[PDB]
Amino acid sequence: ELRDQQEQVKEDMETKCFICGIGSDYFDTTPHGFETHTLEEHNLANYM
Amino acid sequence: KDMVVMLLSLLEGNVVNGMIARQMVDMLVESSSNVEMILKFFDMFLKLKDIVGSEAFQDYVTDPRGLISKKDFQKAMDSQKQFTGPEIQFLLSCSEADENEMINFEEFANRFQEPARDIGFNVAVLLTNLSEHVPHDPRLRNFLELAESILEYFRPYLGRIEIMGASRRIERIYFEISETNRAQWEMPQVKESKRQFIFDVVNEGGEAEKMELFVSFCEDTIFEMQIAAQISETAREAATALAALLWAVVARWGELEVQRVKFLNYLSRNFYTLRFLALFLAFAINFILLFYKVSDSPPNMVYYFLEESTGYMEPALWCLSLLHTLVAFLCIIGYNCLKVPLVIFKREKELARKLEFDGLYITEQPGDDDVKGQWDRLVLNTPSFPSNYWDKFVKRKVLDKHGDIFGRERIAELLGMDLASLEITAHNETWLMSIDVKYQIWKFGVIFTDNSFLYLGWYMVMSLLGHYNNFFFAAHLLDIAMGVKTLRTILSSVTHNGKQLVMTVGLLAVVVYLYTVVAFNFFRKFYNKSEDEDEPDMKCDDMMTCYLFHMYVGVRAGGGIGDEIEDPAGDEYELYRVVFDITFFFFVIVILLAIIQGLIIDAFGELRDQQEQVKEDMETKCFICGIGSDYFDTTPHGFETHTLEEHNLANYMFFLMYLINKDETEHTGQESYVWKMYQERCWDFFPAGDCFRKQYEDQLS
Amino acid sequence: MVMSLLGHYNNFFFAAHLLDIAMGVKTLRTILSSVTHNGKQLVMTVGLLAVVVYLYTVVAFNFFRKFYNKSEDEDEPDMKCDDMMTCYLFHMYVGVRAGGGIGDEIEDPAGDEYELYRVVFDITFFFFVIVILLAIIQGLIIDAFG
Amino acid sequence: GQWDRLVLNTPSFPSNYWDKFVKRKVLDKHGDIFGRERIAELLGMDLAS
Amino acid sequence: TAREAATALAALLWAVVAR
Ligand SMILES: Nc1ncnc2c1ncn2[C@@H]1O[C@H](COP(=O)(O)OP(=O)(O)OP(=O)(O)O)[C@@H](O)[C@H]1O
Ligand SMILES: Nc1ncnc2c1ncn2[C@@H]1O[C@H](COP(=O)(O)OP(=O)(O)OP(=O)(O)O)[C@@H](O)[C@H]1O
Ligand SMILES: Cn1c(=O)c2c(ncn2C)n(C)c1=O
Ligand SMILES: Cn1c(=O)c2c(ncn2C)n(C)c1=O
Ligand SMILES: [Ca+2]
Ligand SMILES: [Zn+2]
């Protein structure tokens, strides 16, 4: 269960944007939606 | 054919309900009798071959000459009843009669087959495109109904793709798939590569990697097809029964050059069968090996062979040793001639694309981080760098691209061409001496880099050294583990959790070492494994001996360290030792060993689950355009329609090969556009989440 | 019926009719069908275990013949690992069944030659053939039933 | 299929099937393509007449 | 059970667990 938790942390981080919640689903229709979204639109470091 | 090509090029680019398509069908109606007559001609002369090839028509043949009379001709096509009476009369008028009222069925069928193939295909393409673009056309329904047999015959050769590249509008493109392409695609040699690629690309999961590796696999598959085309054309009884059962379950001066070529083709054709039979010989030699026995003196230890019918099997091992060695060497030659070109093509393509975009040497900073990237250096200077790759102008293209910035003369000496005079002469327009050394060093270096070739080389070393000691053929028994998929997964499960496994093994070693330290510091009195009181053997007075004994006994036994410990009854430290023994049991037997076992079995379970999930995801959604089956469960038998016609995976490689084959000036607008799009190495022509139905559901009907 | 008629010839044969309980109950039917559900992987796993124990027995015959004495009496030293067939049978009968490696059966090392190599061989046999193969068989069967 | 070939050319072929007229349907479907005599020999029927 | 074997085992263990 612990190992599943560390795996789920990475899975949720990669399939969902932390800043705004939903992600990689509506953006997935646009090519490279999630990558651009997390690099420019909604990024954790840019808020700090 | 030129007529219909012009017509369909005129129609190209139309919307679902456009004036062009409406006028198209209106004009087709305006010549209803004429187009119907043409379609009837095609239908009759196409069903002609089906009629003639049938056994029912063959039964009416009653002449050793092989020519059928006109009366029997009419009777046969009356029995078939496919052709109407006036149609049979017209066919009789068309008969190439030899003045004896006898007509050759074979010549009559074959003569009017080759010239009409292209035009029949084009007419079928036109009719299919009109039906697809404008479904609500009652007038076109009659023409489609008359175009029944022609469409069915030309359907396997026909293929449909739905790339979107113009004005963000999805459109359909049709082309001709030759019989040779599909026939060679049906070869299971490329089918296995298809399975491996469809596993690997889904395993990777990269968004752009999908299309990138798809195109890379298409290029590699085309190269493999080229290679294939160029190369084609008592206890003994129980032990014997067990071996048979195992085998059953597991199994289920120019003349010199001509001979060399024939030998290479022979080895390349049945390399896999050669490997299988080599495995069987390894089984046989190990089985024969299973009957040895040692003795004190020869018939000075002696390894002498003894069993019933020595003449059957003692020379058998002797001859099969050499036979296995020769078979394995032929296996090396076959592997060198078969698959090494494919990997060298992969590496050449990868380095060329890196040199073009990443510009590894125009920037001249490999960094020496990767040994492969460093070894990539020697081969640029060789003129024969791009020979294996289909393109050989990548060096000149990169020169023209980036020599204005980095200096043309700088990369003139780097990329291996003689000088700018070499390109000037190119624009102007013994075999031993033609061999370039550095290219060969790079070639065999990358050959010695690949894992499969080293596995086969280790096989060579073992087979050659097996004559030094016959027991060394037991190493060749590992092909079973390296063969069938289940044992390959079993072996890979060990390496899957390598980091975790080694770390927990280290943790177990740490725990046992700490327990050894405390056992020496407190309980050195109890470790008395000796029986005779005259010469006691204290198992724990030195660190190394005590630690070795712990690692050897405490973990292995399962009961704990106390099994070999003298019973602590009625003595000091009795409770301080019962605590130590119970915590040894609870921390070394029931947890850590269980942790390792669970790690191994869960790694294997995860590997099997991922293998099943690959096949599942194969069906949940189509990976070309990233569309699920939800839109097509709304209609009966829908996802099959998508896979077969809309975004079929097999038809894309046919489309690429068809683009390669025909010349540039014959490309249509869509074909030229997709050619340019691929040449730019930008992948947006793919549907990319947009199917035709998604755009045109309103008028799809 | 055939077994029942055989039973009249010898009553002992009526014991084979007790297997009908398995087909009678759904749970027992699933229990027996677990073996044949994943029998493909199980057969090759058994083959792998046989291959591994064969490698270990040929290694033992090549280098460890003098540690395989099983006869307590010194008058008649019974060399269990005297021939390939006998040594392989002895391993496949005792080592896997014991569950604690072959060290329970082989005479323990007393600091003689090959002591380090002997302990490495014994520990790797224990690991590979106990913690890996038997555990995989157990997990495969229980996971198929689950 | 090799074993079920044996039950084609015998009477009372649809003993348990609801439809006892499958022979006529198979005839009317495939006799034109495969010849009436061949279908008659295969299906075990006496004759088309 | 000599110095060389223990040294090699400890070196391999440290090399693995260092990273
Ligand atoms: N708000 C967010 N900030 C950062 N990453 C996010 C965010 N939301 C989603 N992600 C996803 O997490 C990924 C990065 O996560 P993480 O910090 O674990 O990776 P990293 O390996 O440290 O990053 P990188 O190698 O790109 O520097 C992003 O590429 C993106 O897919
Ligand atoms: N582009 C695609 N998108 C989604 N599914 C596809 C696509 N192309 C093929 N398929 C799937 O392929 C399946 C056919 O696979 P099948 O069981 O016939 O064997 P295969 O592994 O593809 O090998 P082969 O056809 O070469 O014998 C179809 O049922 C379909 O689901
Ligand atoms: C000859 N040829 C190929 O063989 C080829 C290709 N693209 C991929 N391949 C395999 N191109 C553009 C090409 O001209
Ligand atoms: C009389 N009958 C049947 O007996 C039958 C059937 N479908 C199945 N059976 C058994 N139909 C359609 C039918 O008409
Ligand atoms: Ca043109
Ligand atoms: Zn699609």
Please give, one letter per residue, the 3-state secondary structure of B139-155: HHHHHHHHCCHHHHHHC
Long-range contacts of B74-77 (CB under 8 A, 24+ apart): B76/B51, B77/B51
- DSSP letters spanning D10-21: SSSTTSSSS-S-
Ligand nearest to the Cα of B656, by number: 3
Range 59-118 of C in CB contact (< 8 A) with E = 115-116
Q: How many CB atoms lie within 10 A of CB B397?
A: 12
Query: CA-CA distance, B474 to B463, in Å (whole number)?
Result: 10
Gap from CA of A36 to ligand 1 centroid (Å): 11
* Residue B689, min C-alpha distance to chain A (Å): 6
CA B560 to each of CA B82, B541, B589, D46: distance values in angstroms, whole numbers, following the listed order: 88, 20, 7, 85
Ligand nearest to the Cα of B648, by number: 2
* Beta bridge partners of residue A38, listed in sequence order: none
If 0-12 CB within 10 Å is exposed, 13-18 middle and 19+ buried, where does residue A28 land?
middle
Query: CA-CA distance, C92 to C83, in Å (whole number)?
Result: 14
Query: CA-CA distance, B515 to B586, in Å (whole number)?
Result: 13
Element of type H or E holding B621: strand B621-622
User: Which segments within B240-360 are labelled E, that is strand?
Assistant: 292-295, 302-305
* Half-sphere CA count of C3, side-chain side, radius 13 A: 9
Long-range contacts of B229-237 (CB under 8 A, 24+ apart): B229/B184, B231/B265, B231/B268, B231/B269, B231/B338, B232/B269, B235/C85, B235/C89, B236/B291, B236/B307, B236/B308, B236/C85
> If you ran DSSP here, which 8-state letter would residue B566 be given?
P
CA B551 to each of CA B34, B178, B558: distance values in angstroms, whole numbers, following the listed order: 94, 68, 12
- Pairing between strand B627-628 and B169-170? unpaired
Chain B neighbors of E1, CB-CB under 8 A: 544-545, 548
Query: CA-CA distance, B558 to B690, in Å (whole number)?
Result: 61
Query: CA-CA distance, D41 to D46, in Å (whole number)?
Result: 8
Q: What angle do CA B481, B487, B492 make, to 5 degrees?
A: 95
CA B22 to each of CA B15, B134, B542, B654: distance values in angstroms, whole numbers, following the listed order: 11, 8, 99, 31
User: Between B208, B684, B689, which is nearest A29 by CB?
Assistant: B689
- Placement of tokens 């040929």 in the chain: C58
* Residue E1, min C-alpha distance to chain C (Å): 6
Gap from CA of D23 to ligand 4 centroid (Å): 17
**B54·D32 Cβ contact <8 A:** no
Amino acid at B577: R
Query: CA-CA distance, B524 to B42, in Å (whole number)?
Result: 101
**E6·B509 Cβ contact <8 A:** no
CA B535 to each of CA B526, B655, C73, D24: distance values in angstroms, whole numbers, following the listed order: 16, 86, 22, 101
- DSSP letters spanning B111-126: HTTHHHHHHHHHHHHH
Nearest CA to ligand 3 atom 11: B660
Q: Which parts of B are annotated binding residues?
A: 191-195, 390, 618-623, 643-649, 665
* C-alpha closest to that of B211 among B695, B689, B691: B689
* Half-sphere CA count of B387, side-chain side, radius 13 A: 12
Chains in contact with D, where contact means 3 or more Cβ–Cβ distances below 8 Å, are: B
Q: What is the resolution of this structure in A?
A: 3.8
If 0-12 CB within 10 Å is exposed, 13-18 middle and 19+ buried, where does residue D41 land?
exposed
User: Between E1, E6, E17, which is nearest B506 by CB?
Assistant: E17
Gap from CA of B639 to ligand 2 centroid (Å): 11
Element of type H or E holding B165: strand B164-166
Contact C122, C103 (CB under 8 A): yes
Write down how long chain D is: 49
Query: CA-CA distance, B660 to B667, in Å (whole number)?
Result: 11
Query: CA-CA distance, B569 to B580, in Å (whole number)?
Result: 15
Ligand nearest to the Cα of B392, by number: 3
**B54·D38 Cβ contact <8 A:** no
**E17·B509 Cβ contact <8 A:** no
Element of type H or E holding B170: strand B169-170
Amino acid at B78: D
Would the CB of B390 count as within 6 Å of ligand 3? yes
Query: CA-CA distance, C121 to C101, in Å (whole number)?
Result: 10
- Placement of tokens 């600091």 in the chain: C111
Contacts of D45 (CB under 8 A, 6+ apart): D23, D27
Q: Hey, of B164, B168, B207, B210, which one would you mutate to test binding to chain A, going by the most A CBs within 10 A of its CB?
A: B207
* C-alpha closest to that of B591 among B504, B495, B678, B465: B504
Contact C26, C132 (CB under 8 A): no
Task: Choose one of A14, A15, A48 to mutate for the ligand 1 pocket test, by most ligand atoms within 8 angstroms of C-beta.
Answer: A14
CA B127 to each of CA B35, B134, B156, B648: distance values in angstroms, whole numbers, following the listed order: 11, 11, 16, 21
Q: How many CB pairs under 8 A join B and D?
A: 11
If 0-12 CB within 10 Å is exposed, 13-18 middle and 19+ buried, where does residue B462 land?
middle
Contact B298, B443 (CB under 8 A): no
**A31·B626 Cβ contact <8 A:** no
Query: CA-CA distance, B225 to B204, in Å (whole number)?
Result: 25
Instruction: Say how far residue A22 (Cα) sits from the centre of its chain.
Output: 8
Alpha helices (H) in chain D, listed in sequence order: 22-34, 36-43
Amino acid at D49: S
Residues with CB under 6 A from ligand 1: A 13-14, 17-19, 34, 38, 42-44
Long-range contacts of B32-38 (CB under 8 A, 24+ apart): B32/B143, B35/B143, B36/B143, B36/B146, B38/B123
Residue C122: phi, psi to the nearest 5? -65, -45
Contact B577, B567 (CB under 8 A): no
Q: Do chains B and C touch (3 or more CB pairs under 8 A)?
A: yes
Query: CA-CA distance, B698 to B696, in Å (whole number)?
Result: 5
Residue B345 has which token pair? Answer: 């093509």
Atom of ligand 1 nearest to the CA of A34: 31
Query: CA-CA distance, B349 to B241, in Å (whole number)?
Result: 52
* C-alpha closest to that of C92 among C110, C80, C78, C77: C80
- Placement of tokens 């009526």 in the chain: C14
Nearest CA to ligand 3 atom 4: B390
* C-alpha closest to that of A35 among A46, A24, A48: A24
Contact B472, B465 (CB under 8 A): yes
Alpha helices (H) in B533-637, listed in sequence order: 543-549, 555-557, 574-584, 592-620, 630-633
Q: Is B306 on the interface with E (CB under 8 A)?
A: no
Atom of ligand 2 nearest to the CA of B639: 31
What does the CA dihedral B291, B294, B299, B304 come to, rounded to 10 degrees? 40
Long-range contacts of B346-352 (CB under 8 A, 24+ apart): B346/B216, B346/B220, B347/B446, B348/B385, B348/B386, B348/B388, B348/B389, B349/B216, B349/B219, B349/B389, B351/B376, B351/B379, B352/B386, B352/B389, B352/B391, B352/B394
Ligand nearest to the Cα of B623, by number: 2
If 0-12 CB within 10 Å is exposed, 13-18 middle and 19+ buried, where does residue B183 land?
exposed
Residue B593 has which token pair? Answer: 């060993």
HEC sequence for B265-278: HHHHHCHHHHHHHH
* Residue C65, min C-alpha distance to chain E (Å): 22
Helix or strand or coil: residue C77?
coil
Chain B neighbors of A31, CB-CB under 8 A: 207, 684, 688
Would the CB of B191 count as within 6 Å of ligand 2? yes
Would the CB of B137 count as within 6 Å of ligand 3? no
- Pairing between strand B68-69 and B102-103? antiparallel
Residue C74: phi, psi to the nearest 5? -80, -15
* Half-sphere CA count of B644, side-chain side, radius 13 A: 8
Residue C105: phi, psi to the nearest 5? -95, -45
Contact B170, B164 (CB under 8 A): yes
Atom of ligand 2 nearest to the CA of B188: 26
Residue B228 has which token pair? Answer: 């294939």
Element of type H or E holding B307: none
* C-alpha closest to that of B686 among B658, B649, B632: B649
Amino acid at C72: E
Q: Which parts of A are annotated binding residues?
A: 13-18, 38-44
> If you ran DSSP here, which 8-state letter would residue B175 be given?
E
Query: CA-CA distance, B514 to B350, in Å (whole number)?
Result: 52
Contact B473, B288 (CB under 8 A): no
Contact B690, B164 (CB under 8 A): yes
Query: CA-CA distance, B335 to B268, in Å (whole number)?
Result: 8
Q: Is E5 on the interface with B (CB under 8 A)?
A: no
* C-alpha closest to that of B340 among B260, B188, B227: B227
Contact B102, B67 (CB under 8 A): yes
Q: What angle do CA A34, A40, A42 make, to 5 degrees?
A: 70
**A28·B626 Cβ contact <8 A:** yes
User: Between C85, C103, C126, which is nearest B239 by CB?
Assistant: C85
Residue B679: phi, psi to the nearest 5? -65, -35
Nearest chain B alpha carbon to D37: B56
Atom of ligand 2 nearest to the CA of B623: 3
Chains in contact with B, where contact means 3 or more Cβ–Cβ distances below 8 Å, are: A, C, D, E
Gap from CA of D19 to ligand 4 centroid (Å): 7
CA B341 to each of CA B25, B344, B443: distance values in angstroms, whole numbers, following the listed order: 52, 5, 10
If 0-12 CB within 10 Å is exposed, 13-18 middle and 19+ buried, where does residue B624 land?
buried
Nearest CA to ligand 3 atom 14: B660
